[PDB]
Scaffold this active site. Sequence first.
Site, short mmCIF file in Angstrom:
data_model
loop_
_atom_site.label_atom_id
_atom_site.label_comp_id
_atom_site.label_asym_id
_atom_site.label_seq_id
_atom_site.Cartn_x
_atom_site.Cartn_y
_atom_site.Cartn_z
N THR D 1 62.23 9.73 -44.04
CA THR D 1 61.52 10.56 -44.93
C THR D 1 62.16 11.75 -46.72
OG1 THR D 1 59.86 11.62 -43.01
CG2 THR D 1 60.32 13.08 -44.65
N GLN D 2 62.03 11.12 -47.28
CA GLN D 2 62.94 11.35 -48.49
C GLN D 2 62.16 11.33 -49.38
OE1 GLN D 2 65.41 8.60 -49.90
NE2 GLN D 2 66.82 8.23 -48.98
#
Lengths: 4, 4, 195, 233, 212, 240, 222, 204, 235, 244, 231
Positions: D1-2
């Site tokens: 998760t970026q």
Amino acid sequence: AXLX
Amino acid sequence: AXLX
Amino acid sequence: MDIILGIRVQDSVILASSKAVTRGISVLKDSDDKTRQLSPHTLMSFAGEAGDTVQFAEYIQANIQLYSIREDYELSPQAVSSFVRQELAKSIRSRRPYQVNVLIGGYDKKKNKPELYQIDYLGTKVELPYGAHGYSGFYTFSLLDHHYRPDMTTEEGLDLLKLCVQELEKRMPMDFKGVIVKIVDKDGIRQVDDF
Amino acid sequence: TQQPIVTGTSVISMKYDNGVIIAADNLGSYGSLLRFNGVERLIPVGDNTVVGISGDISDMQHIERLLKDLVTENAYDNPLADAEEALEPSYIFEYLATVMYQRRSKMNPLWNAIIVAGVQSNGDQFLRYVNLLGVTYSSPTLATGFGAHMANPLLRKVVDRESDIPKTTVQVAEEAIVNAMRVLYYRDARSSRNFSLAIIDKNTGLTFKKNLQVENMKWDFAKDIKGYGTQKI
Amino acid sequence: TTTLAFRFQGGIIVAVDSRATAGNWVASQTVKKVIEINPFLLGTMAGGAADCQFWETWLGSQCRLHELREKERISVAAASKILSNLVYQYKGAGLSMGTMICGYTRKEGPTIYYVDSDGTRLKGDIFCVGSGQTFAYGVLDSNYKWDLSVEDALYLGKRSILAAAHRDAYSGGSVNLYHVTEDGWIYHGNHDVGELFWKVKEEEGSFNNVIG
Amino acid sequence: GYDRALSIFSPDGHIFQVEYALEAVKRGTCAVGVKGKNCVVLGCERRSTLKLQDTRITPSKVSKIDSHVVLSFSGLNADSRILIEKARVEAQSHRLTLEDPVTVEYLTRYVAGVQQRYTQSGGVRPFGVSTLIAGFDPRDDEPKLYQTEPSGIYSSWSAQTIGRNSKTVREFLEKNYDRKEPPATVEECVKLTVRSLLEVVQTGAKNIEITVVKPDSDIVALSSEEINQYVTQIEQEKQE
Amino acid sequence: QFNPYGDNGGTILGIAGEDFAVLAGDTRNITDYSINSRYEPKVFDCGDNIVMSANGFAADGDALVKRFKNSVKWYHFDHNDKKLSINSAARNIQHLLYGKRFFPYYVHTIIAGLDEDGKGAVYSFDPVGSYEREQCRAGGAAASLIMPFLDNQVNFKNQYEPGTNGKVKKPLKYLSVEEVIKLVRDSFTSATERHIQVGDGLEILIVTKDGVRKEFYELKRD
Amino acid sequence: SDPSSINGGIVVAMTGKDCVAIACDLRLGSQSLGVSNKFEKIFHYGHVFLGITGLATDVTTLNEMFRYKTNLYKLKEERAIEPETFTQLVSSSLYERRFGPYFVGPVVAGINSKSGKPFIAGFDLIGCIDEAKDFIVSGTASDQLFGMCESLYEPNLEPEDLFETISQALLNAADRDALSGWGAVVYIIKKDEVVKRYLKMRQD
Amino acid sequence: DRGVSTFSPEGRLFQVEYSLEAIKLGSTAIGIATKEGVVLGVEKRATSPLLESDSIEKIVEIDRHIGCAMSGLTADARSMIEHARTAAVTHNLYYDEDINVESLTQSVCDLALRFGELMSRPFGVALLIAGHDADDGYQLFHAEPSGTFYRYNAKAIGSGSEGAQAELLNEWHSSLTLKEAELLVLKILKQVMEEKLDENNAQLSCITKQDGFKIYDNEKTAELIKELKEKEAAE
Amino acid sequence: GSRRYDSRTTIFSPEGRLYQVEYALESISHAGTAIGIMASDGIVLAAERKVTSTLLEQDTSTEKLYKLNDKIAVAVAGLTADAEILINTARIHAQNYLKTYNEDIPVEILVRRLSDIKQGYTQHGGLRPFGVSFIYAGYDDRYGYQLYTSNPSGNYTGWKAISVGANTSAAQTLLQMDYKDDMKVDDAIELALKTLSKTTDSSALTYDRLEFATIRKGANDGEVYQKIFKPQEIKDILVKTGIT
Amino acid sequence: NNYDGDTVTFSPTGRLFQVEYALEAIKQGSVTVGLRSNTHAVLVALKRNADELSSYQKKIIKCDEHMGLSLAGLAPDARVLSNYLRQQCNYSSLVFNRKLAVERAGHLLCDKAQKNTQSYGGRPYGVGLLIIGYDKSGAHLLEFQPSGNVTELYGTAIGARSQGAKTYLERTLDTFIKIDGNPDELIKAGVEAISQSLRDESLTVDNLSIAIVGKDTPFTIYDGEAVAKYI
Ligand SMILES: [Mg+2]
């Protein structure tokens, strides 16, 4: 997805 | 919880 | 699940437990026995989250029966209750805790006394003259505060219980389909068949 | 998760009769700030493959390093490393596609869209796309970002199906690509004027042009536009 | 889904519908919701199509291994408890199943266990399970006698599924029927509601709510 | 972990550590099991180089595994506790998952399996114990008696004995036990069991234990006098 | 927040005759309102006379097809080059899918070939591996448009014998390959008319005892 | 949903002239429902006294835990644990559960048997020591206890005077809290006798 | 001492070779493959007359289409059988079909060399694995603790094996009926057994495509024993 | 590899004995004798110290007798350091039982677990066994007064009277001779000291070469008290029975 | 002698005896031959039986469409190593869409074997392998020994009496190396090579095993009636  |  | 009561009189412990099993808008069953014999003089009733209740009860039953075989001896009600409490007290901080409440009724043969333990799913244990879990207590505790005497006979106990079940059938929102009653005394555990 | 920080906009590309062209501007944006201007987003691998990348630049630099390590590893105990066992464009692609899909499957993607352009050893043109989801596809033209919206319709006017590729010369195709880049500079708020372009020809090999500029721009009509409706002066 | 199973004088009846839905989309009208585990064991499916199908055919493999290891057919109680102990391990993961495990053994007699994905396991004589369960219950309960002939029992089961197929939007297709005895299970056919409804309306004179 | 392969093959195809475990059984006090028509009896010698023993609390030699099955043994006593615990746990686990107590065959097969596992695992020696396991399957009245040994092999016996001088008492039983007519009663069967033990034991004093197992979880240990009576009564039929 | 799924559109369709079976799918690939490619095949010859399509999220579709193809490879290696029967393929694919029950492949899967008596077979799967054999199945974006057409034209549903007072159903019967390709082509042109994610091209893989043949047809490109 | 006020209850402790007192109520409830009237919250390990308020399951658990730890302490050290030391052991044990704590408010009271000094202390749920000359308070009626104590208390009370004072602080605080009361116990602790008195209080 | 995984100078694994000795000490097992079935028979060898011989289980079901006989340290075979059964049932779960006999046998054989310093020693038991499958018909396999397996038309293992194998060499032909093969297994067993063959100390079994794997009762075997004496007497 | 240097502590001899257990027992046989005697009204533990120097601090010392809980003590013969390892384990196990069941641990249950630990060191892990034998003396309300012993094999048995360590042959013969069932504690105290007096390898038994404990109901009414004798108390009990 | 207890011990002349004893099981193995032209590569193997009632142990294993091998020595060890090869070929396809170079297959086997010749508790592999394949640089034959030594050759042979064939191939070199575009001629030469290693036996129909791979032939294996053509 289905159920029954 | 007690603070200072 | 829902209704579980217990009263301790002079010479026994009586457990009453509702027979209905309901899921959704359907009563799937009206003859469910919400109880497991832990040893010949110890009985445990249970109520709570579907599945969790039986899984927990049978697991305790398996452990107590193992102890009995190992030592050729029956654990006292106080000891069994403490074992059960510890199991629930561990569980409450697990990844998925057992959501089960129990009443443990036993006849201690060393003391010749009946004993009733009320334990909730957090592992909160209390010894009591009479006990209940869930919404049931909200009617029965006060009723029993009034009518209960410490020296009652087993017959007086059952009449007192008729009062409790009557009140619950009058004021409770749900049809719990009656109770199965069981007596624990010096001679073991038996079931009353017409209640 | 970026979430992507420093980013590169469109990568555009097409097949022509003898090869493939691919281009991309030299900008690394930081939200609406046009932060960095000398950023090369086309990475040549051998002399038969260019990999163009859009999206997060930190992840692009990571991918550069993977590719440069892949070249090294392929040379190991390989006496035909610069011949029959040279890295093909199809090998380089599948490797990248594999990584992209694994990283999406570990819920920690490489925040990019990638086009691998080159010529196979049998002379066939290679053009294929892969992104952060591991989705892959091939087409006579490919573009990422705004490129997909604005370049593709222009480039498909030239090559609209398989049979149009033999009919398309490198002069024609470079024109289309260079014109598409101008349009994107008119219309994409996160594009720059400066860009790089690379041709991979089955005869001439790899030509890599740096420091191109968008030229022959139409702005004159701007003077005639006064107000937003009723105003005259 | 609608599924049912009931005990009576002449063994066990098992009847199910054949519809699968994704929302309002009718995905199939030809699902086999009864799984034949062994010649004396049946499992019914309701809930997630995959969850049920997968774990119930997995259950069959586990029952087969019991009989190889123990030189004996598995008890209904033990077969049902394998499935329920399995789903209890997955409690909270979001499995969706309501199943009945139906069979005869010499030690047990004809036996039905209800087993669901919250980990509930109940022995009993009558259960209906699925989105159509209440409709099935209404008919079934109001005509049920311990002493129904095999002939009547089969019809009641079939008729109860028909009732639910009609009223419940998420039940339909066809009725599948089984009878379980001391000698094992016997299949009693696939019955399209397409033709069965009209046949029952005519012959029985019920379904007057419907434009004839 | 400690890994060493202690149970390995020798050039002649023997596993010496298993065979030496058998030697430890041979040195153990004698145990015998005899099955009647409708009961099974377990007799055990207790070596009498020990007075000042406290018999109330000293570990008895027959163990209940569940309330319908008993196990006795000859060999290393500490080793036998490990097998009994594992067996007891399995008995409860079988009830939990199958909703039926163990068959005598099943429980025997389990104990046997444990014994075998210890003959091909690194870092462990075999169990210096052989067992007699006896009782009645649930809702069955046909008596069961099984024997296990360090190698893991197990089998069913009309009657059997293990431990020191077991060959003498196996000898006895082989000529005194009629397959065709097993000890038709408790009284009868207990006697045959005590007779066979008297071949090897000494005084029948605080030297013999007997435990009787009848169907539906009916297990009772005889006490000194009840056994003593059997001893007295056999020597008085002996002078002939 | 990162969303690990996408939707690449398209639609697929399987029909089974007496001694053949077909698996068709359009060749358009999309995301949102953009076309990614007008020719990106998604029906595959997997060996052993089995064709397979897994339609929905393409990255998942490709991973699954790859895994099944590989499964066929190892089935040969481990079981002495034995042919993988369609029923066995189906069950294997159930385990591939259900193995990812808690992070599913977002695809609707169809396979086609011949059963062990040489009859045509079509199997379909939900995303987590429920499966069933049928004469007939459409899947993917336009499934809901095409499926009811197939109930009517392949299984003759709601069709009666004229003048029998709606008492005698049209009798069931297998279709020629020529008839089946007609229903496929019509199914896809109709679907293309009314669904924005369907178009560009149509590829049909036909499976008989002599192997796998392909046919291709242009579809509207708007 | 606030674990520290599901069951209810209170504990207070005070110092006097060569004595200490520690008291608690007897209520155990489940929110509005009173369940038990006999739930004591004070325990002792030799001559060291520990009161615990908060979640009853943890109260029970912690008593069982400190019995364990002090039993082993006695066996190894060959003497009874002193209040100053026990205070430290309580602190360690709570802070060890820093990011998944016991929902309790413990209070320690006793007389050091070497130095004769009276000693009291209180803790938060994660082990912070509060040592005090005068009084320590704990539980759902702690605000009220603070008020009662701060006004009623004076230094150097004789044991029978200290008894009245601590009892009046407890009773009147309990009566302003819906979750405390239902009975009460007071321990008066002198250097080597300890009297335990049950108070008569309103049962509502 | 010296490692459990050591090669001899002849290039053989000491521990494997020694386990082969233990197998020679085992009771006799014989199997014969026909086009009508495969027979498996064994010598029970009760070590004392008190031991109830029906409790001796040296023939064992693996699946409906596969059966097993053993010889050597028979306690070592429990886990091999357990693995075999699991492998067979699992295959049917994954593939909705019967697992091939050869594949089954290869699976069991994979276990064999997983020992070292995984288990501590090789198995001390050989297996005869007999079954049917649609592809290669009726099959018999001899599975050793070396990890090697061989298909056979007929094979004997255990103490009487070199005698019995020579006999099988003479008697086997490609057209034996099942009934001929049953008799033959009985005949050859009676030859190599110490004590006198009867229905209580030998046991028979077969696997046919039609009824799968069955172990014969003592009444049925006793009658094939009787039928065998009358065949021999009569010439 | 390292296989070269492995003594293989957990194997059988060709006779089916455990070498290391046998050799450990041999070690124990040179240890100070310890004796347990059980009466109807209590238990005695007496043990002889391994031969003193006059400069040893004898009152703040403990070598033989250890408290396990309030109802159970042990007498040690063997390696002291080995014994403490086991003693702390046993002390912890007692507390776990109490914590779990709110009842003091039954004597046998404690004895079984310790013996089970010992057993493990003889079957797996390739470690040397513990060179210790214990006499356990305790009370519980199931069996009342109990004596047990355990040794490096992890075998345990119960006794009316027993000795461990040096000269147990002579000591056992003497206890057999004079022990009788109806005996009181004070008689058992005398028997224990008289037995050590005759089996000692020292010239004469003095207070400073002993440890001594009783477990009586001799507190107040239906409850039990452990008394570990101070040196001066032993000196007195040695006079009181005329050994000095 | 004192130095052959395990693989982790060198002898005083710098030898590894366990590795050498592993090499010995290869020598007891039935003979097998490899040889190649520029267009194909062929394996021939003599299969051995237990007795006349038994099957003839397979000695050839397919690794991929373009690769495969023959074995001499411990068969389970070939199963382990061939299975590793299958995986490595497989990984090259799924990840790089690249058919694994026969040379790399060589290097990968060498490195796998070597690990088991330097660490305590393991043991060397007891089998020799001949690997053939057709890849981006043509036909290849490799020889693998469990010392970890792998070698590329025009032809070779291993097992008992393999020295006959290895000599024959050494003279025949200039002929067979140039049998291009003719499968059956390359095989014939292979069958003749193996015949130089027979004694008291000759090639029967259920005794001989052949495999071929090359330009437009997937690696395939011939047994039974399919080899009668060649006897
Ligand atoms: Mg209040």
